[PDB]
Design a protein around this ligand. Structure first.
Ligand SMILES: CC(=O)Nc1cc(S(=O)(=O)O)cc2cc(S(=O)(=O)O)cc(O)c12
Ligand SMILES: CC(=O)Nc1cc(S(=O)(=O)O)cc2cc(S(=O)(=O)O)cc(O)c12
Lengths: 146, 146
């Protein structure tokens, strides 16, 4: 118990430099501050599930995931997928609090890093589609500091 | 799942105006922002347990309680009491984060309120021992806004 519980915060953020798959799903593991990010063409229940399938392979199974009241997060589909995995689903607290700052900071840091890396490579606008995956993996690696 | 999980933050804060029992155990329920506070002569494993016994009667059984690495919180006694109740015990996270701000804010608000109420009653220093209980209950009621 000496540590923090395994609770994630997940959201989607739009990054046109990564079009056609410009919807970035971002998960922060509040226990490690580790960040996992995947690319999606659309924000659907199935994109959220695919994102978490990847995050589970990378981080392990959390006890709970905190999102907002987004439809992709509150659909019957998504409710059932989390039940199948045994993962509790939670939401932001009270006390003039917003959704969840940590994953929001992560959105920003993530977008700044992609921008820095892309321009360094000579992409001032959209990143060529064949380069996007390696550049995203590089931004994730950097953010995770290791 | 539509709500936040039942996770508490608990700490002790020293309030000489409430001497001889000047150790205040404070629990914030992060799901409701409700505050429970009890008075203790000393900071021991048994004081923490007595405090939580009271907080359970008032708030219900939480899923987890977050404290610091205090001995009263990490003793075998306390570890066993939480196990007996089925309550997970957790700690502060990483990312340059401190222990737990919400319960720290609550310490301050609580001490300011006691001070305001005591002086209003004419107690500029220690609160007479026979008055302390009702004044503490009144400060808790106020803080919980209701
Ligand atoms: C378990 C726990 O303690 N969680 C938390 C601790 C603190 S803190 O201020 O005390 O650091 C703030 C929190 C803020 C939010 S949010 O609704 O704004 O997104 C959610 C939490 O879950 C928080
Ligand atoms: C479950 C959850 O999200 N918890 C939390 C959310 C956020 S927030 O910045 O995202 O609001 C901040 C937190 C800070 C701490 S602490 O180590 O500083 O005490 C602990 C938490 O548990 C927090």
């Amino acid at each position: 118990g000496l540590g923090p519980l395994q609770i994630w915060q997940t959201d989607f953020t739009l990054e046109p430099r990564m079009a056609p798959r410009s919807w970035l799903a971002v998960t922060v593991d509040t226990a490690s501050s580790a960040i996992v990010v995947t690319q999606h063409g659309r924000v659907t229940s199935v994109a959220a599930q695919h994102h978490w399938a990847t995050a589970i392979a990378v981080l392990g199974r959390p006890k709970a995931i905190k999102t907002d009241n987004g439809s992709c997060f509150t659909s019957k589909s998504t409710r059932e997928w989390l039940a199948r995995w045994g993962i509790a689903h939670t939401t932001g607290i009270p006390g003039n609090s917003q959704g969840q700052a940590m994953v929001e900071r992560a959105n920003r840091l993530l977008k700044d890093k992609i921008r820095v890396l892309a321009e360094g490579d000579g992409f001032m606008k959209r990143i060529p589609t064949s380069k996007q995956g390696e550049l995203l993996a590089k931004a994730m690696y950097a953010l995770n500091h290791f």
